[PDB]
Design a protein around this nucleic acid. Structure first.
Ligand SMILES: Nc1ncnc2c1ncn2[C@H]1C[C@H](O)[C@@H](COP(=O)(O)NP(=O)(O)OP(=O)(O)O)O1
Ligand SMILES: [Mg+2]
Ligand SMILES: [Mg+2]
Length: 342
DNA sequence: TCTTGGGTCCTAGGACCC
DNA sequence: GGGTCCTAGGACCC
C-alpha cells in the first residue's frame, strides 16, 4: 500500500519575489541578507549570484569578496507571507493533506486524490503551472512514495522542474545516494559516518542496526531505515508553533550591561507584538533569554513563567550577564518564550 | 569571509513522585 | 527504583 507523496518547493524564493516585483533585478546578481557592517549572512540569492558561489548562510563579507557587484536587499516579509498564503490556497484546491515546512515548501499526500486520473506527476505539473500563472513565480516538485525521497527529488530538477521516483526505481536510487542528502544529516553527522566508512545509503544497508543504535541512538534507527527507503511519517496538516523568540546581533560587540539593557528594551515590544498575534492574553508556559558571546558559545536561561513579563526578562538577563560571561564581548541578545501546551 | 533569525526535535541529569 | 517535569545545550532546517 504505497502513498503518492509530493514535495513542492519554490525556486530561490525570496529573490524570486524581489525580481518579480522589480524586473530590473532580473539578470544581475542579488541577494537578501543583512549588510556586511551589520554582521549579516545571506538569506538567499538568485542564480546570477549563485554562479559566483554565493550560498545561504554565507557571511555577507564573503558574498561580496566573491561577487563584488552583489546588490543586497533587506527583504520584505509581508511579500513572502502573501506569496506563501496564495501557494497554500493553491494546494488546498487539490488536497487537504498539506504539511507546510516553511513559507515556501509543503508536502502533499495525494494518494486519495481524484484530480488527474490519480497521476501524482500530472498533479505536481498542474500545481507548478497555476503557481506560475497567478504568482509569476516558479516552483519545483518531487514525487515519491515517502516524505524524504519526494524531498530529495524536488531538488533534482530545479529550477522550474520536477522529478518522479517510483517504488521500482527506489532501490537503484538509494544505492549511490550520499547519506548527507538525507534531511537530518548535516556536517557533523556526515563527518562521523564518513569517519567510519559510511558515505552512501548503499554502505548503511551493509550495516548492523545494533551497532547503529550503540553509537547514534534514535538517529541510527532513522539512518538505517532511510537507507532502506523506509519512511513511515504521515503528512499531518495539524502542526502548531510551539515557541517564539526574538534576537539581535550588534554591529559591534557590547561590553557594558547598560548597553545590553538598552537592547532588551528595544526587543520586548517586538516580542510582545508577535505573541499577541497568537495569544492576546499573553499567556505562556515559560519565558527566558539568550546570550551569545565573542567565543561564540551561546547560553540561555529559561524558566517556567505564566505571562510574558518585561522586568523578569531584564532580571534574568542581568543574572545571566553576571554569572556567565567573564569579560567576553557579547554579539547578540535575544528573548524567548514557550507556548502553552495545547 | 567571518560566521542571521526564525524555528524543530533529541539528549541528559537531577528533582520530584509513587 | 521507574517515570515525568525541569532546564541547558546542540544539531539541524529554511
Ligand atoms: N540559512 C538561512 N537563513 C535565513 N533565511 C533563509 C536561510 N535559508 C533559506 N532562507 C530563506 C530564504 C529562502 O529564499 C527561503 C526558502 O528556503 P530554500 O528553499 O532553502 N532556498 P531557496 O528557495 O531560496 O532556493 P532554492 O531555489 O534552492 O529553493 O528561506
Ligand atoms: Mg525553495
Ligand atoms: Mg525550501
Amino acid at each position: 500500500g504505497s502513498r503518492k507523496i509530493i514535495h513542492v518547493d519554490m525556486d530561490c524564493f525570496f529573490a524570486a519575489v524581489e525580481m518579480r516585483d522589480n524586473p530590473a533585478l532580473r539578470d544581475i546578481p542579488i541577494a537578501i541578507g543583512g549588510s556586511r557592517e551589520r554582521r549579516g549572512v545571506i538569506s538567499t540569492a538568485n542564480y546570477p549570484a549563485r554562479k559566483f558561489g554565493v550560498r545561504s548562510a554565507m557571511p555577507t563579507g564573503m558574498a561580496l569578496a566573491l561577487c563584488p557587484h552583489l546588490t543586497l536587499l533587506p527583504g520584505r516579509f509581508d511579500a513572502y507571507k502573501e506569496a506563501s498564503n496564495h501557494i497554500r490556497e493553491i494546494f488546498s484546491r487539490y488536497t487537504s493533506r498539506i504539511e507546510p515546512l516553511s513559507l515556501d515548501e509543503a508536502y502533499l499526500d495525494v494518494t486519495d486524490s481524484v484530480h488527474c486520473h490519480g497521476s501524482a506527476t500530472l498533479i505536481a505539473q498542474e500545481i507548478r503551472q497555476t503557481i506560475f500563472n497567478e504568482l509569476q513565480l516558479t516552483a519545483s516538485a518531487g514525487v515519491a512514495p515517502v516524505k524524504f525521497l519526494a524531498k530529495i527529488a524536488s531538488d533534482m530538477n530545479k529550477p522550474n522542474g520536477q522529478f518522479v521516483i517510483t517504488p521500482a526505481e527506489v532501490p537503484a536510487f538509494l544505492q549511490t545516494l550520499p547519506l548527507a542528502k538525507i534531511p537530518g544529516v548535516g556536517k557533523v553527522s556526515a563527518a562521523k559516518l564518513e569517519a567510519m566508512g559510511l558515505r552512501t545509503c548503499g554502505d548503511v544497508q551493509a550495516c548492523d542496526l545494533v551497532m547503529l543504535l550503540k553509537r547514534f541512538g534514535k538517529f541510527g534507527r532513522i539512518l538505517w531505515e532511510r537507507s532502506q527507503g523506509i519512511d513511515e511519517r504521515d503528512v499531518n496538516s495539524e502542526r502548531l508553533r510551539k515557541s517564539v523568540g526574538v534576537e539581535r546581533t550588534m554591529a559591534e560587540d557590547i561590553h557594558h550591561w547598560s548597553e545590553c539593557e538598552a537592547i532588551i528594551e528595544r526587543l520586548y515590544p517586538e516580542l510582545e507584538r508577535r505573541l499577541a498575534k497568537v495569544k492576546p492574553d499573553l499567556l505562556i508556559a515559560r519565558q527566558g533569554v539568550k546570550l551569545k558571546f565573542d567565543d561564540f558559545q551561546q547560553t540561555t536561561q529559561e524558566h517556567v513563567w505564566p505571562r510574558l513579563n518585561k522586568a523578569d526578562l531584564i532580571a534574568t538577563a542581568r543574572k545571566t550577564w553576571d554569572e556567565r560571561r567573564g569579560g567576553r564581548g557579547v554579539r547578540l541578545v535575544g528573548l524567548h518564550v514557550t507556548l502553552l501546551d495545547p
